[PDB]
Short mmCIF file of all heavy atoms in Angstrom, two decimals:
data_model
loop_
_atom_site.label_atom_id
_atom_site.label_comp_id
_atom_site.label_asym_id
_atom_site.label_seq_id
_atom_site.Cartn_x
_atom_site.Cartn_y
_atom_site.Cartn_z
N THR A 1 91.46 -60.12 -62.90
CA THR A 1 90.41 -59.18 -63.30
C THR A 1 90.58 -57.85 -62.61
O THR A 1 90.66 -56.81 -63.28
CB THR A 1 89.02 -59.74 -63.02
OG1 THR A 1 88.95 -61.07 -63.51
CG2 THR A 1 87.96 -58.91 -63.73
N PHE A 2 90.66 -57.84 -61.27
CA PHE A 2 90.69 -56.54 -60.63
C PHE A 2 91.89 -55.73 -61.09
O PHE A 2 91.79 -54.51 -61.22
CB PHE A 2 90.68 -56.64 -59.11
CG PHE A 2 90.12 -55.40 -58.43
CD1 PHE A 2 88.89 -55.45 -57.79
CD2 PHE A 2 90.80 -54.21 -58.45
CE1 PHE A 2 88.37 -54.34 -57.17
CE2 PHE A 2 90.27 -53.10 -57.83
CZ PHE A 2 89.06 -53.17 -57.19
N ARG A 3 93.00 -56.38 -61.40
CA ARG A 3 94.14 -55.59 -61.84
C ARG A 3 93.86 -54.96 -63.18
O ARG A 3 94.13 -53.76 -63.37
CB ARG A 3 95.40 -56.43 -61.85
CG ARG A 3 96.70 -55.67 -62.16
CD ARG A 3 97.84 -56.33 -61.33
NE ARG A 3 99.21 -56.06 -61.76
CZ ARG A 3 100.06 -57.00 -62.17
NH1 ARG A 3 99.71 -58.28 -62.19
NH2 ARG A 3 101.29 -56.65 -62.53
N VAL A 4 93.24 -55.69 -64.10
CA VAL A 4 92.97 -55.04 -65.38
C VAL A 4 91.85 -54.00 -65.26
O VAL A 4 91.95 -52.92 -65.86
CB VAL A 4 92.69 -56.08 -66.48
CG1 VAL A 4 92.40 -55.39 -67.79
CG2 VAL A 4 93.91 -56.90 -66.65
N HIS A 5 90.76 -54.30 -64.54
CA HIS A 5 89.68 -53.33 -64.38
C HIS A 5 90.16 -52.05 -63.72
O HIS A 5 89.72 -50.96 -64.10
CB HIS A 5 88.55 -53.92 -63.56
CG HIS A 5 87.55 -52.91 -63.08
ND1 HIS A 5 87.57 -52.39 -61.81
CD2 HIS A 5 86.45 -52.38 -63.67
CE1 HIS A 5 86.55 -51.56 -61.64
NE2 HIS A 5 85.85 -51.54 -62.76
N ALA A 6 91.03 -52.17 -62.71
CA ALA A 6 91.52 -51.01 -61.96
C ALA A 6 92.57 -50.22 -62.72
O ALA A 6 92.64 -48.99 -62.56
CB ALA A 6 92.08 -51.47 -60.62
N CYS A 7 93.40 -50.89 -63.54
CA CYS A 7 94.37 -50.18 -64.38
C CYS A 7 93.69 -49.52 -65.60
O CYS A 7 94.16 -48.48 -66.07
CB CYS A 7 95.49 -51.17 -64.77
SG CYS A 7 96.81 -50.70 -65.97
N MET A 8 92.58 -50.08 -66.09
CA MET A 8 91.88 -49.45 -67.21
C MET A 8 90.97 -48.32 -66.75
O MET A 8 90.75 -47.36 -67.49
CB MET A 8 91.08 -50.50 -67.98
CG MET A 8 90.17 -49.94 -69.11
SD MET A 8 88.70 -50.94 -69.50
CE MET A 8 87.71 -50.78 -68.01
N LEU A 9 90.41 -48.42 -65.56
CA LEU A 9 89.42 -47.43 -65.19
C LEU A 9 90.02 -46.07 -64.84
O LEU A 9 89.31 -45.07 -64.92
CB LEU A 9 88.62 -47.94 -64.02
CG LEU A 9 87.29 -47.25 -63.93
CD1 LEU A 9 86.64 -47.48 -65.25
CD2 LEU A 9 86.47 -47.83 -62.80
N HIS A 10 91.30 -46.02 -64.42
CA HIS A 10 91.94 -44.82 -63.85
C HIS A 10 91.19 -44.31 -62.64
O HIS A 10 91.41 -43.17 -62.25
CB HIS A 10 91.97 -43.60 -64.80
CG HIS A 10 92.54 -43.84 -66.15
ND1 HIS A 10 91.97 -44.69 -67.06
CD2 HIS A 10 93.56 -43.23 -66.80
CE1 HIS A 10 92.66 -44.66 -68.19
NE2 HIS A 10 93.63 -43.78 -68.06
N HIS A 11 90.34 -45.11 -61.99
CA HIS A 11 89.47 -44.65 -60.91
C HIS A 11 90.17 -44.85 -59.58
O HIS A 11 90.67 -45.93 -59.31
CB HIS A 11 88.15 -45.40 -60.90
CG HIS A 11 87.20 -44.99 -59.80
ND1 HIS A 11 86.21 -44.05 -59.98
CD2 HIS A 11 87.04 -45.47 -58.54
CE1 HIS A 11 85.50 -43.95 -58.86
NE2 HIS A 11 85.98 -44.80 -57.98
N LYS A 12 90.16 -43.81 -58.75
CA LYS A 12 91.11 -43.78 -57.64
C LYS A 12 90.74 -44.80 -56.59
O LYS A 12 91.52 -45.70 -56.29
CB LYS A 12 91.22 -42.39 -57.02
CG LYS A 12 92.41 -42.36 -56.08
CD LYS A 12 92.37 -41.23 -55.10
CE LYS A 12 93.50 -41.37 -54.09
NZ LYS A 12 93.14 -40.74 -52.79
N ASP A 13 89.55 -44.66 -56.00
CA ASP A 13 89.18 -45.48 -54.84
C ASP A 13 89.12 -46.96 -55.19
O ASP A 13 89.55 -47.83 -54.39
CB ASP A 13 87.85 -44.97 -54.30
CG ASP A 13 87.90 -43.48 -53.99
OD1 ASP A 13 88.91 -43.04 -53.38
OD2 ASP A 13 86.97 -42.75 -54.40
N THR A 14 88.64 -47.27 -56.40
CA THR A 14 88.82 -48.62 -56.93
C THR A 14 90.27 -49.04 -56.75
O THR A 14 90.56 -50.04 -56.10
CB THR A 14 88.42 -48.69 -58.40
OG1 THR A 14 87.00 -48.77 -58.55
CG2 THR A 14 89.04 -49.92 -59.02
N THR A 15 91.21 -48.21 -57.22
CA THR A 15 92.61 -48.58 -57.15
C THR A 15 93.11 -48.61 -55.71
O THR A 15 94.10 -49.30 -55.43
CB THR A 15 93.43 -47.64 -58.01
OG1 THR A 15 92.89 -47.67 -59.33
CG2 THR A 15 94.81 -48.14 -58.13
N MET A 16 92.47 -47.86 -54.80
CA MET A 16 92.81 -47.94 -53.37
C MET A 16 92.40 -49.24 -52.73
O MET A 16 92.99 -49.64 -51.72
CB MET A 16 92.20 -46.80 -52.57
CG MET A 16 92.74 -45.41 -52.90
SD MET A 16 94.53 -45.35 -52.74
CE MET A 16 94.66 -45.71 -51.00
N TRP A 17 91.39 -49.92 -53.27
CA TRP A 17 91.09 -51.22 -52.70
C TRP A 17 92.28 -52.17 -52.81
O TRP A 17 92.60 -52.88 -51.84
CB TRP A 17 89.85 -51.83 -53.34
CG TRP A 17 89.33 -53.01 -52.57
CD1 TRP A 17 88.73 -52.99 -51.34
CD2 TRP A 17 89.30 -54.36 -53.00
NE1 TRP A 17 88.37 -54.26 -50.97
CE2 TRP A 17 88.71 -55.12 -51.97
CE3 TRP A 17 89.73 -55.02 -54.16
CZ2 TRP A 17 88.54 -56.48 -52.07
CZ3 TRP A 17 89.56 -56.37 -54.25
CH2 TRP A 17 88.97 -57.09 -53.21
N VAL A 18 92.98 -52.17 -53.95
CA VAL A 18 94.13 -53.07 -54.14
C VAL A 18 95.26 -52.79 -53.13
O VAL A 18 95.95 -53.71 -52.65
CB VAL A 18 94.61 -53.02 -55.59
CG1 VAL A 18 96.08 -53.44 -55.70
CG2 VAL A 18 93.73 -53.90 -56.44
N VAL A 19 95.46 -51.51 -52.79
CA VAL A 19 96.46 -51.23 -51.76
C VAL A 19 95.91 -51.63 -50.39
O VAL A 19 96.68 -52.10 -49.54
CB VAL A 19 96.93 -49.77 -51.80
CG1 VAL A 19 97.16 -49.36 -53.28
CG2 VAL A 19 96.01 -48.84 -50.98
N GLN A 20 94.59 -51.49 -50.15
CA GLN A 20 94.02 -52.02 -48.92
C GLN A 20 94.41 -53.49 -48.77
O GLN A 20 94.64 -53.98 -47.65
CB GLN A 20 92.49 -51.89 -48.87
CG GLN A 20 91.88 -50.48 -48.82
CD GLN A 20 90.34 -50.49 -48.84
OE1 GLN A 20 89.70 -50.21 -49.85
NE2 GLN A 20 89.76 -50.85 -47.71
N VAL A 21 94.55 -54.19 -49.91
CA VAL A 21 94.93 -55.60 -49.90
C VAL A 21 96.41 -55.79 -49.57
O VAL A 21 96.78 -56.48 -48.60
CB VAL A 21 94.56 -56.25 -51.23
CG1 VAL A 21 95.34 -57.53 -51.43
CG2 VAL A 21 93.06 -56.47 -51.25
N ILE A 22 97.30 -55.23 -50.41
CA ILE A 22 98.72 -55.44 -50.13
C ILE A 22 99.04 -55.05 -48.70
O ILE A 22 99.70 -55.80 -47.95
CB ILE A 22 99.61 -54.69 -51.14
CG1 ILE A 22 99.37 -55.19 -52.56
CG2 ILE A 22 101.10 -54.76 -50.77
CD1 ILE A 22 100.27 -54.51 -53.56
N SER A 23 98.50 -53.91 -48.26
CA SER A 23 98.69 -53.49 -46.88
C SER A 23 98.24 -54.57 -45.88
O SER A 23 98.98 -54.90 -44.94
CB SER A 23 97.94 -52.18 -46.62
OG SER A 23 96.54 -52.39 -46.51
N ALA A 24 97.04 -55.16 -46.09
CA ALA A 24 96.52 -56.15 -45.14
C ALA A 24 97.47 -57.33 -44.93
O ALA A 24 97.65 -57.79 -43.79
CB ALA A 24 95.16 -56.65 -45.60
N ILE A 25 98.08 -57.85 -46.02
CA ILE A 25 98.98 -58.99 -45.75
C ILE A 25 100.24 -58.49 -45.05
O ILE A 25 100.77 -59.18 -44.17
CB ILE A 25 99.37 -59.87 -46.96
CG1 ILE A 25 100.21 -59.14 -48.03
CG2 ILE A 25 98.17 -60.71 -47.49
CD1 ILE A 25 101.13 -60.11 -48.85
N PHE A 26 100.77 -57.33 -45.44
CA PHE A 26 101.98 -56.91 -44.74
C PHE A 26 101.75 -56.72 -43.25
O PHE A 26 102.59 -57.09 -42.42
CB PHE A 26 102.61 -55.69 -45.40
CG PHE A 26 103.55 -56.07 -46.50
CD1 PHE A 26 103.14 -56.14 -47.81
CD2 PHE A 26 104.84 -56.49 -46.19
CE1 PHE A 26 104.01 -56.55 -48.80
CE2 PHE A 26 105.72 -56.89 -47.17
CZ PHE A 26 105.31 -56.92 -48.48
N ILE A 27 100.60 -56.17 -42.87
CA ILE A 27 100.41 -55.99 -41.45
C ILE A 27 99.99 -57.26 -40.70
O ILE A 27 100.16 -57.31 -39.48
CB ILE A 27 99.44 -54.84 -41.14
CG1 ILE A 27 97.98 -55.19 -41.33
CG2 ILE A 27 99.70 -53.67 -42.08
CD1 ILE A 27 97.10 -53.95 -41.18
N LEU A 28 99.47 -58.32 -41.33
CA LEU A 28 99.24 -59.53 -40.53
C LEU A 28 100.55 -60.10 -39.99
O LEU A 28 100.67 -60.40 -38.79
CB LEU A 28 98.48 -60.60 -41.30
CG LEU A 28 98.00 -61.63 -40.25
CD1 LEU A 28 97.51 -60.93 -38.95
CD2 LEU A 28 96.91 -62.58 -40.82
N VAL A 29 101.51 -60.35 -40.87
CA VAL A 29 102.86 -60.82 -40.56
C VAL A 29 103.60 -59.83 -39.64
O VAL A 29 103.80 -60.10 -38.45
CB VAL A 29 103.66 -61.04 -41.87
CG1 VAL A 29 105.08 -61.57 -41.63
CG2 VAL A 29 102.88 -61.92 -42.86
N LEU A 30 103.95 -58.63 -40.16
CA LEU A 30 104.83 -57.75 -39.39
C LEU A 30 104.13 -57.29 -38.13
O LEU A 30 104.76 -57.17 -37.08
CB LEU A 30 105.28 -56.52 -40.18
CG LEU A 30 106.42 -56.51 -41.23
CD1 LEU A 30 107.68 -57.19 -40.75
CD2 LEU A 30 106.03 -57.05 -42.59
N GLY A 31 102.83 -57.06 -38.24
CA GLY A 31 102.06 -56.65 -37.08
C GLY A 31 101.91 -57.73 -36.03
O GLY A 31 102.05 -57.46 -34.84
#
């Protein structure tokens, strides 16, 4: 859902939440 809602909305900060996510897993491991 979030991927379709965020790709359809073109809304920036909405779309920044998804990068807040990918970032969070990369920094648990590497961090």
Side-chain angles (χ1 to χ4, degrees):
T1 312
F2 205 110
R3 186 146 161 241
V4 180
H5 167 261
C7 173
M8 174 207 67
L9 202 56
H10 308 64
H11 179 94
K12 191 198 173 208
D13 306 315
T14 281
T15 305
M16 293 305 297
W17 194 69
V18 156
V19 317
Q20 295 177 257
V21 161
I22 298 182
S23 75
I25 65 153
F26 272 94
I27 78 187
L28 194 40
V29 182
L30 280 312

